[PDB]
Ligand binder design. Structure first.
Ligand SMILES: NC(=O)c1ccc[n+]([C@@H]2O[C@H](COP(=O)([O-])OP(=O)(O)OC[C@H]3O[C@@H](n4cnc5c(N)ncnc54)[C@H](O)[C@@H]3O)[C@@H](O)[C@H]2O)c1
Ligand SMILES: NC(=O)c1ccc[n+]([C@@H]2O[C@H](COP(=O)([O-])OP(=O)(O)OC[C@H]3O[C@@H](n4cnc5c(N)ncnc54)[C@H](O)[C@@H]3O)[C@@H](O)[C@H]2O)c1
Ligand SMILES: NC(=O)c1ccc[n+]([C@@H]2O[C@H](COP(=O)([O-])OP(=O)(O)OC[C@H]3O[C@@H](n4cnc5c(N)ncnc54)[C@H](O)[C@@H]3O)[C@@H](O)[C@H]2O)c1
Ligand SMILES: NC(=O)c1ccc[n+]([C@@H]2O[C@H](COP(=O)([O-])OP(=O)(O)OC[C@H]3O[C@@H](n4cnc5c(N)ncnc54)[C@H](O)[C@@H]3O)[C@@H](O)[C@H]2O)c1
Ligand SMILES: Nc1ncnc2c1ncn2[C@@H]1O[C@H](CO)[C@@H](O)[C@H]1O
Ligand SMILES: Nc1ncnc2c1ncn2[C@@H]1O[C@H](CO)[C@@H](O)[C@H]1O
Ligand SMILES: Nc1ncnc2c1ncn2[C@@H]1O[C@H](CO)[C@@H](O)[C@H]1O
Ligand SMILES: Nc1ncnc2c1ncn2[C@@H]1O[C@H](CO)[C@@H](O)[C@H]1O
Ligand SMILES: [Cl-]
Ligand SMILES: [Cl-]
Ligand SMILES: [Cl-]
Ligand SMILES: [Cl-]
Ligand SMILES: [Rb+]
Ligand SMILES: [Rb+]
Ligand SMILES: [Rb+]
Ligand SMILES: [Rb+]
Ligand SMILES: [Rb+]
Ligand SMILES: [Rb+]
Ligand SMILES: [Rb+]
Ligand SMILES: [Rb+]
Lengths: 417, 417, 414, 414
């Protein structure tokens, strides 16, 4: 069984997946080894991911390794229906994912996924792992381990750990060097603006753009907003990233001060209610708000809907809320990750490395079953470094190597004058 | 006793030190607390640092804390003679440092410094700590601990540790967030180009600039070279920084390929012989080479002097080597850190944080004497974070703070859908 | 009446036109003056433009001015069918424009437009004016004047003038300060990369991108490619813009040297066959070629078709040509204007100033009928400056004004 | 004979002049043609320029051309004393220029220069030409023509023309493509920040920097300030450059709003009193003000002096004004050209093209004696283009050339 929009989209989905593969050579090399070695023979796997052409290439690599996989959507609005159709029709992979599905459907998919009795859970935001631990304690004996794709899910796993309920190994994929140094920064930077421009066709040049958060994602978004000619305001809660943002040329201020000035607001904090009613109240007429953090809770949309006297779709992915004072607030993507909701997410070039990490993390869990302590686990350095070497080579870039004389110099300490 | 160029420069040096203090408010606040609390009462201290207006403000803060300090130069060419005169004449601090001193003099200063029988050694490159361990094993009982300012010295300390001879605590100042995130990146970026432009008055726009190394320093130099209109080539030995440099818009290649194309070469690798005779051989006529890593050994200057049939000073800090084929290679600063040799080093704004870390690391060593294991020690997070908070405040920048509702959200794991 | 795809798209086109109008405040003010003063009463007008939400707002303003207008597509791939439906159904403006129309349909539409016997012709690339001068010498008595939107069209008019056949006033809209300083530069800079990304979802960071031409468009394309993390090569034929590109941090080289290195090629020259058979042969496997200058002839696609053993459609707006050695060349938008073929063209903020220039140029032609010398006329300085003043004000930006003593000091020399 | 600081500096000045010549290949080629053709034989010439290693290379080229030249300083703070020594001692060129000379010495030098009875005057800011027109109406019969190096001077000449006293040809060197596209933009962009950093060693990253003016100089200053990590505010009086600055990512606002926010203020307007008493009163404690336009009058330093209770010299080229409330305002270079007062002026790469224009303009004036209309003359296009071609070639950059079919296609319109 499966639950998708339209099985007839599989031929289009097959073509989209092959296009995306053009820039996933590291994952393709992993798939080919998996086809030989079958690391997941006999393993049941659940993946809660954005159902995109990039996720399909990861699902196909796990299929080649022998995994009995079931895929559900990580977000109601990021699903690519033609991809879902292709995975069902061409690979026989159960997919429960419909673009635009409601909340009841999403939760029912999570339940169907746990009924698959997975041994490995690939999660993106930790919804499925949190549901497992809260509602399916009786299933924990099935678990070899889990993996977590994104920053928000890592925070949830720490909270699970500190609550004493992370009773199995969980691979921190997000914090691998070849994941958040490129995916979170360069990918979010391009695809966030992609989603905004597809939604609105607004000229970014000459606009004031407010980026909440200056971590890996915020650095990318601010960098690319600036590259497209915007005046960039950064907000923060920590002084180290705040100083960095100033020395990168951006204006740093509290959100209450930014709210008067922004034309476009982008949240990338991983936090709740970063943009609040006290902020909507002072925004310019026609201000655009959107979110590129994992959950929409970064913008208090519930309060906006309550205050507004009217909402209407004015363009694809674009809603205009009209406030009782007659001013309007424009929301893109209903507050969901704008790159995936209004565009196609990150280019496959960065997802190659992110999903290479996912594939090898799953292999790590199986090859080390019964030898990993419960709790969080970093990607092994050798694996992280090998992904980077292979990606650099596939990009056609050559670099230098240390000579034996340089190796000797590093190990020396008496010399230097 | 002391060993300086000219005591009569103290009035000029006093004015230079006060100017530099305009942007060192975090260190000034530390000095004022030190004046009250006298943490270094009865402590003998040796500092091997670049004798600059920034180092003077740190020396004055240690003096206010009661330290019996002696200062020697970290590099023969970075000394500011008027600063040396002021510290001797106005504070009575022994300074052994002459701009342009030869190697015999430098080594004799190191010996005089160890004869001071220090309890704390502040080192910049680890020369004095390596000399202590190799030649003064009988003095180790004096040592409360040491600190290390820069990346090259950290590498030496690891080699000492792995050789089993790091038998005392050593504070890793360089790797504090408020040190290498700003000093190594934003400071080196501006002051490296400062030194090059003061030496030559070359238009950087339209030149090809080759940056060897894409760590904290290389990121800054490349960023600012690009900001000044240069075509930037990056060389590397590791794939993670190499990919970053490409996604930042720079051309990544092996040095053998870069050597044909560069107009200006800047080494910031911390490594030996990054630019070798096989590279000089193919450089454009008039190519400029310089170094911003701690030691000049990054450029094989010994071989260049041997091949050249002639050398002459053509401008301040600027030497033209003429090769037997009649082509010329231009060397700035005799291969020594070009920012300090041809200009004035980093602006005091970043050295405020670097030397705030130095001052509190020394206080940490004394307040925890007899409770630190031998080996390397990171700056405590609370200290690192407090420097950043105080610097952000002194820069006049305000940011947000987490509400209790957001704190609750972070500690929650069942919520998120 | 009209020739369009589906009139049932009119309500969607209306919503799209209204969305675009949000950032066309200057043209809005012009439309409202036009509806009162009716400067185009009794005037027939043909517009040959990209049939976009921005052109619609222009057509709506001319219609408010009394103009009996007829619109045809400047390019078969840039037409927005919902916009064509809205203009016909909501405004009664005849539109001859179907997205994807073939060449015969295009040329038929141009003949239908000339049968309107226009007094004013707004052109984009000069196709209709050249046809008029060539085939309809008897209709020149109708012509009060024409306008030309784009750089390629200005060059063709210059050739028309030098040939001695430019026997009427033509307003050079493209060279207005408030046109090519912004439209050609910032407009093309964003919308060109927009089209590439919508076609391919390729990561620009880390790629070598080759920009042919460093005029207004190339400056904009190179600036935004750099801002998205790309390594930028520029090619040129003139030394002055070539030195600018180097001092802007870009590599400058002949296209034959760049052909071995680029991952993405963008032509913005206005000239013919800038990317040539001998470049395709040495390109990297999977290199992308696209064009942002007015006509697709910037790329020698005919040669690529005969060099390739196979061509497949692999993504929207994207063709993969496979050469006998198995290497691929990717073409976006069949070589037509990549911003308008694979995306939506310039954001309406810049089209506000370009189309304010069109509207006031048409007013200029009518208010000066029988008084203008034949040939090309630049936009009047006061018109151009007042557009900039209205736009800056609409952007919410305030600037300074000289004091009486500062004005005095300018006019002193002692 | 001459009036200089110390002739014993000649050998050091020679080494400095030779170093600068390395990146003046175009002027080198001109000098070598001049030494053969001797276009200035029997011609007397006055040059009022910044006495730098770059101006020396110009003077050396004119001397090779047979010119009987006399050089005086354009600005008391920009003079390089070793260069003045080398020109006198090694070339026998009379130089009247001492770094730090007072106002009376400057005006005396200008009178000495006019007593040379020059046939050609090379000016920078138009001080000597205006004095000639004002006080030496009897000497106009000597004048074959003059040249003007900088934007401020072109404005003064326009006022001279409109007043009716520009009774001779003046070559507009500043507006040559190969002059203000590079000198004014990339030259001032680097050398202005160079002067600030040499004066203060302040970190630019993290600072708000206010650039008054977004012409060629302001574009360059803003571009490089941004590249060094600064938050850039731009002020303007014209909407067209104001919209450019916004679309370049900069904040645009009136100077009175910027005065509360800037850490560093840079004036590049050519106008009088752009930073005013009411701005000083609201500036942040320790704000830095400096000027990069030709004259120091861009900043109302007289008002600052009367608002301050105290002034101290705290660094080279740096004054600290302390206001009654204890807040400080920092002035660099006494408000004179910060790049030339606190550093060395433009790198010689761009002065190569500016001074190639000077040299060929002087040749133009002499080769066209008695044939030129009175008034201002632009640099001839072929001169300007050939300078760009020689410079690009000297930079080692190769570009493309149109093929015969591409030339054909330009000239077709059908
Ligand atoms: N849309 C995408 O494709 C995509 C990709 C990767 C990650 N993400 C998501 O983006 C979010 C950010 O991830 P990251 O890797 O940048 O995290 P990060 O830990 O590197 O950075 C988050 C930053 O936000 C700051 N911050 C926290 N609360 C804030 C507040 N109230 N106001 C302002 N700043 C605040 C923190 O100080 C920190 O610097 C997460 O939800 C992550 O899951 C999205
Ligand atoms: N001049 C200054 O004021 C200043 C300031 C801080 C540090 N430094 C010095 O600069 C140097 C670099 O410090 P950092 O903090 O950037 O170190 P880092 O560890 O952050 O980076 C060094 C980088 O160089 C690369 N590398 C090593 N050998 C290489 C080689 N042969 N070719 C190319 N790349 C190579 C490494 O892969 C790494 O990415 C050190 O000597 C440090 O002491 C100088
Ligand atoms: N797609 C769009 O939305 C859009 C917008 C505006 C203009 N355009 C088109 O873009 C083209 C260029 O317009 P522009 O305003 O930048 O023109 P321009 O005259 O300002 O600049 C064109 C540049 O191309 C250079 N060039 C010419 N032939 C060349 C060749 N063979 N190789 C390399 N460089 C060459 C020229 O020297 C010049 O610098 C025109 O066809 C114009 O109609 C398109
Ligand atoms: N220091 C140097 O080496 C150097 C080099 C070249 C030119 N200059 C000088 O720089 C100045 C400017 O030259 P340019 O070529 O950029 O001139 P420009 O004519 O191209 O630009 C000047 C700009 O300043 C603006 N402006 C005028 N008054 C203003 C005011 N009160 N407030 C704000 N903006 C105002 C104008 O609108 C214009 O955009 C001149 O004095 C020129 O002589 C100095
Ligand atoms: N194209 C994509 N396909 C799948 N996952 C994606 C894509 N773009 C972004 N993501 C992932 O979504 C996560 C946020 O939910 C990020 O960690 C990122 O890796
Ligand atoms: N102005 C300066 N004064 C003192 N030390 C400096 C200065 N500029 C750079 N340094 C230091 O020199 C070290 C390299 O030897 C760097 O770690 C850096 O912190
Ligand atoms: N959205 C758009 N609507 C109409 N014309 C456009 C649009 N984007 C670009 N153009 C115009 O198309 C011309 C190229 O033929 C450019 O001169 C430009 O003004
Ligand atoms: N190094 C220099 N030598 C001579 N003139 C210079 C130099 N730097 C800038 N200038 C000139 O000074 C003028 C300003 O008066 C500018 O037009 C510029 O051409
Ligand atoms: Cl592998
Ligand atoms: Cl403290
Ligand atoms: Cl109007
Ligand atoms: Cl010549
Ligand atoms: Rb896709
Ligand atoms: Rb409501
Ligand atoms: Rb060593
Ligand atoms: Rb100093
Ligand atoms: Rb030798
Ligand atoms: Rb949570
Ligand atoms: Rb549109
Ligand atoms: Rb010089």
């Amino acid at each position: 069984k499966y639950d998708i929009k339209d099985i007839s989209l599989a031929p289009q989905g097959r073509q989209e997946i092959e296009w995306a593969a053009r820039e996933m050579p590291v994952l393709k090399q992993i798939r080919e080894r998996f086809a030989q070695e079958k690391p997941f023979a006999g393993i049941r796997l659940v993946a809660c991911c954005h159902v995109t052409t990039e996720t399909a290439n990861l699902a196909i690599a796990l299929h080649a390794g022998g995994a009995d996989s079931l895929l559900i959507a990580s977000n109601p609005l990021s699903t690519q229906d033609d991809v879902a159709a292709c995975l069902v029709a061409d690979y026989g992979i159960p997919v429960y994912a419909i673009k635009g599905e409601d909340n009841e459907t999403y939760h029912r998919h999570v339940q169907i996924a746990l009924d698959h009795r997975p041994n490995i859970i690939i999660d993106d935001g930790s919804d499925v792992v949190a549901t497992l631990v809260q509602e399916r304690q009786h299933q924990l004996s099935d678990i070899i381990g889990t993996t977590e794709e994104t920053t928000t899910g890592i925070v949830r796993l720490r909270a699970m750990f500190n609550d004493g309920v992370l009773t199995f190994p969980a691979m921190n994929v997000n914090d691998a060097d070849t994941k958040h140094f490129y995916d979170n920064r360069y990918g979010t930077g391009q695809s966030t603006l992609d989603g905004i421009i597809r939604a609105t066709n607004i000229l970014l040049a000459g606009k004031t753009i407010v980026v909440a958060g200056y971590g890996w994602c915020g650095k990318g978004v601010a960098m690319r907003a600036k590259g497209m000619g915007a005046d960039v305001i950064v907000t923060e809660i920590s002084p180290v990233p705040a100083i960095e943002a100033a020395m990168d040329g951006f204006r740093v201020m509290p959100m209450a001060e930014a709210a008067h000035q922004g034309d476009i607001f982008i949240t990338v904090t991983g936090n709740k209610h970063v943009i609040r009613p006290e902020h909507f109240a002072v925004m310019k007429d026609g201000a655009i708000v959107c979110n590129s953090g994992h959950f929409d809770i970064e913008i208090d949309l519930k309060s906006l809907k309550e205050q507004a006297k009217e909402v209407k779709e004015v363009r694809n992915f674009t809603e205009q809320y009209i406030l009782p004072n007659g001013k309007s607030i424009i929301v893109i993507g209903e507050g969901r990750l704008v790159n995936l909701a209004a565009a196609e997410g990150h280019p496959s070039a960065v997802m190659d490395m992110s999903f290479a990490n996912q594939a090898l993390a799953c292999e790590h869990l199986v090859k080390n079953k019964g030898q990993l302590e419960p709790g969080m686990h970093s990607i092994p350095v050798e694996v992280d470094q090998e992904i980077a070497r292979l990606k650099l080579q596939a990009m056609g870039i050559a670099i230098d190597s240390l000579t034996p004389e340089q190796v000797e110099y590093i190990n020396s300490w008496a010399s230097g004058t």
